[PDB]
């Protein structure tokens, strides 16, 4: 039995050995900056592999999932998924705002316009490794292209392309076959990378622990951890199971038990995109969910649905505002809530710590962007829990959308 699940136990042992090695090296050894950088080399290699595999997986899976569905019922399923994601994000934002205000632990228009611009890129080839940003200048607007994959535009193009080739009929069957084969090949390559994962996980955790030097910053920011962790726990244990139970009259915790494999995997990597194959297997096999709904809903949720991220950012922005003793009125609460939801619509193909999402909210509330370094220390610990919450929300949404589309799925069975 151990051989079949050998990757999971190996990764758990890697986590244990990483904590031990990091603590022992930090306490009993002295390292310079260059030596600390060279210590985390295998973790850097693992991250490069995952970033490499993101693009083909996302594009091919999106096209295949959209083209599988019939054109009659494609719109309703997408609308239901969008509504669920929007509602969950709003509830998470409200919960985070309420908790951060109660506990008290301590332009933007251009960013929104850039967000809309990135949905319709000028060039498809450039959109695979570059993004678009605008800045003011003495007032004249000037645009520039910066490195970083544009997952928002590629997802929109993939959705439209999949619909077009699924409506065409026999004339576009060769394209469907091409992208199905590409998706299968990408999943197999992801498995091959997951074979090597444990060593990268070991060295990543070891490097994470060693970096902290003072070790009193954790004690100072103890209240800040409690707010974020309590919000994530309440959202994961209370709100999401209750929403699932209201729509689907089943046991919400049996679904989580079936998805436990992908949940713990998502904790390991802390990447929602890289957990797509495990999530597919767990949803289709353990929970007996339909493949047609799953293959289409899950990639969209990975790119779009970010409950833990919205909660995390909102709490951090309010905490930073409280650090500076800046007053926050009723309007300030709303504009932080609204900006947090729409800050980073798509950031799935980017598996590393992004401070730009915080910077948008900071600019909207009118605070300097140099306050990020104060709390940049604990991101390495909080990000894994945030990604786990995101993956859990996606998994719950798959079943919720599947239940609500019984008539559409029955209509799709007579044409098969
Ligand atoms: Na949501
Ligand atoms: Na997600």
């Amino acid at each position: 039995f151990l051989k079949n699940n050998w990757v999971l136990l190996s990764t758990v042992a890697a986590v244990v050995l990483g904590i031990t090695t990091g603590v022992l090296v930090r306490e009993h050894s002295n390292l310079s900056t260059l030596e600390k950088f060279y210590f985390a080399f295998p973790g850097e290699i693992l991250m490069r592999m995952l970033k490499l595999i993101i693009l083909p997986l996302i594009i091919s899976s999106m096209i295949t999932g959209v083209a599988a569905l019939d054109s009659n019922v494609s719109g309703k399923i997408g609308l239901r998924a969008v509504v669920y994601y929007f509602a969950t994000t709003l509830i998470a934002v409200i919960l985070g705002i309420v908790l951060v205000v109660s506990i008290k632990p301590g332009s933007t228009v251009d960013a929104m316009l850039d967000l809309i611009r990135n949905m319709f890129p000028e060039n498809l080839v450039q959109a695979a490794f570059q993004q678009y940003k605008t800045k003011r200048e003495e007032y004249k607007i000037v645009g520039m292209y910066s490195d970083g994959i544009n997952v928002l535009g590629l997802i929109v193009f993939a959705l439209v392309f999949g619909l077009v080739i699924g409506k065409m009929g026999e004339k576009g069957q060769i394209l469907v076959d091409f992208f199905n084969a590409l998706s299968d090949a990408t999943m197999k390559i992801v498995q091959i990378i997951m074979w090597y994962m444990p060593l990268g996980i070991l060295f990543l955790i070891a490097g994470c622990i060693i970096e902290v030097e003072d070790w009193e910053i954790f004690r100072k920011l103890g209240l800040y951890m409690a707010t974020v962790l309590t919000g994530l726990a309440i959202h994961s244990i209370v709100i999401l199971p209750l929403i699932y139970f209201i729509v689907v009259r089943k046991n919400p915790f049996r679904f989580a038990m079936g998805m436990a494999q992908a949940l713990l995997t998502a904790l390991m990597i802390s990447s929602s995109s890289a957990t797509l194959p495990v999530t597919f297997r767990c949803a289709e096999e353990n929970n007996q969910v339909d493949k047609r709904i799953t293959r289409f809903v899950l990639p969209v949720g990975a790119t779009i649905n970010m409950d833990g991220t919205a909660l995390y950012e909102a709490v951090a922005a309010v905490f930073i505002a409280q650090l500076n003793d800046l007053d926050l009125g009723i309007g300030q609460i709303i504009t932080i809530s609204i900006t947090a939801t729409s800050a980073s619509i798509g950031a799935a193909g980017v598996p590393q710590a992004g401070l730009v999402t915080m910077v948008i909210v900071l600019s909207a509330v009118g605070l300097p962007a140099e306050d990020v370094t104060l709390i940049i220390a604990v991101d390495c610990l909080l990000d894994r829990f945030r990604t786990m919450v995101n993956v859990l929300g996606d998994a719950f949404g798959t079943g919720i959308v599947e239940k609500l589309s019984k008539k559409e799925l029955e209509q799709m069975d007579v044409s098969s």
Side-chain angles (χ1 to χ4, degrees):
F1 180 84
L2 170 142
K3 172 250 171 298
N4 219 24
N5 311 358
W6 79 273
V7 82
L8 228 60
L9 319 177
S10 190
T11 324
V12 171
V15 162
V16 171
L17 284 184
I19 292 178
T20 298
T21 298
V23 162
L24 254 74
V25 166
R26 203 195 97 94
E27 224 175 341
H28 290 36
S29 178
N30 184 19
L31 294 94
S32 77
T33 310
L34 272 179
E35 295 164 10
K36 286 204 300 174
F37 176 77
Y38 290 156
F39 194 87
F41 193 72
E44 177 188 2
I45 295 299
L46 180 64
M47 300 305 128
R48 293 185 76 90
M49 302 181 178
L50 303 166
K51 286 168 177 54
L52 163 65
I53 211 57
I54 270 176
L55 174 98
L57 179 61
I58 279 286
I59 278 185
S60 42
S61 289
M62 191 53 189
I63 288 167
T64 292
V66 175
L69 292 176
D70 294 349
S71 323
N72 330 97
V73 308
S74 56
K76 317 177 79 78
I77 304 175
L79 181 71
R80 295 202 248 269
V82 162
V83 165
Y84 167 82
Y85 292 148
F86 185 79
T88 36
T89 305
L90 189 64
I91 295 181
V93 164
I94 296 165
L95 171 60
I97 285 283
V98 162
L99 263 175
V100 74
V101 165
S102 194
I103 293 186
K104 285 156 208 270
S107 67
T108 174
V109 190
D110 278 355
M112 306 275 110
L113 296 179
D114 289 356
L115 208 80
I116 299 187
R117 285 182 175 107
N118 281 328
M119 274 169 213
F120 309 104
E122 285 177 354
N123 194 226
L124 275 172
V125 162
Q126 205 175 15
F129 68 99
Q130 272 187 349
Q131 263 176 339
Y132 192 76
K133 47 154 279 290
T134 60
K135 64 211 300 173
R136 292 185 186 189
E137 174 197 334
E138 201 66 340
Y139 277 153
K140 177 202 175 2
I141 314 281
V142 181
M144 204 194 108
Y145 271 99
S146 51
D147 265 321
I149 184 178
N150 183 29
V151 190
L152 188 55
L154 297 170
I155 279 297
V156 165
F157 182 80
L159 207 152
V160 171
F161 190 72
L163 284 170
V164 163
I165 69 177
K167 222 173 305 177
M168 255 179 34
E170 42 273 40
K171 284 172 321 163
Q173 188 67 40
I174 179 177
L175 299 162
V176 171
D177 301 337
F178 186 86
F179 283 109
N180 295 9
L182 209 64
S183 181
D184 278 358
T186 320
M187 272 153 205
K188 297 185 69 174
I189 299 177
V190 164
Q191 270 171 16
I192 296 173
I193 292 178
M194 281 315 168
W195 281 350
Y196 160 80
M197 175 180 58
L199 212 69
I201 286 295
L202 166 48
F203 277 83
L204 265 153
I205 292 183
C208 164
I209 296 178
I210 294 176
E211 283 288 321
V212 195
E213 296 298 324
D214 279 341
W215 213 253
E216 71 88 29
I217 184 163
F218 287 146
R219 194 57 57 95
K220 274 193 126 173
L221 289 188
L223 270 283
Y224 165 75
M225 321 275 268
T227 310
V228 193
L229 290 187
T230 303
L232 289 176
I234 289 179
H235 194 62
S236 317
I237 300 183
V238 179
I239 298 181
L240 285 178
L242 190 49
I243 287 176
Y244 180 97
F245 183 77
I246 282 169
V247 178
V248 192
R249 317 304 287 262
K250 294 186 183 179
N251 184 235
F253 300 98
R254 200 75 50 76
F255 213 93
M257 178 139 65
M259 291 285 328
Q261 273 248 5
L263 291 194
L264 163 72
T265 319
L267 206 66
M268 281 316 117
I269 313 84
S270 178
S271 182
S272 295
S273 301
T275 319
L276 273 178
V278 192
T279 322
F280 284 150
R281 290 197 63 248
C282 290
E284 290 162 20
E285 306 296 333
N286 300 106
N287 294 144
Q288 292 300 131
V289 193
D290 208 277
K291 184 172 63 68
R292 289 164 288 185
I293 302 290
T294 288
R295 297 301 179 98
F296 170 57
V297 160
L298 274 185
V300 182
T303 322
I304 278 284
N305 194 27
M306 324 276 201
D307 314 329
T309 298
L311 203 144
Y312 195 179
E313 303 305 335
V315 167
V318 177
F319 169 69
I320 287 197
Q322 273 168 325
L323 274 187
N324 291 164
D325 293 298
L326 172 67
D327 214 10
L328 297 182
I330 325 170
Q332 266 91 16
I333 278 174
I334 281 180
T335 182
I336 288 160
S337 153
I338 297 203
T339 318
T341 291
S342 206
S344 55
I345 286 295
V350 175
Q352 76 276 4
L355 90 165
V356 183
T357 305
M358 205 199 264
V359 153
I360 316 148
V361 195
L362 272 176
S363 72
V365 83
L367 281 161
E370 299 87 31
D371 310 337
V372 50
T373 62
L374 314 170
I375 74 198
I376 204 182
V378 278
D379 184 1
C380 302
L381 176 61
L382 299 192
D383 184 1
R384 286 155 119 82
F385 290 97
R386 161 255 304 268
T387 290
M388 198 213 64
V389 172
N390 297 351
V391 170
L392 179 77
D394 284 8
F396 268 109
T398 279
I400 285 171
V401 173
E402 191 248 16
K403 161 92 199 321
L404 283 175
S405 300
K406 276 298 117 189
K407 216 198 269 164
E408 279 70 36
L409 285 180
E410 290 185 350
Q411 188 180 325
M412 222 186 307
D413 278 334
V414 315
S415 308
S416 66

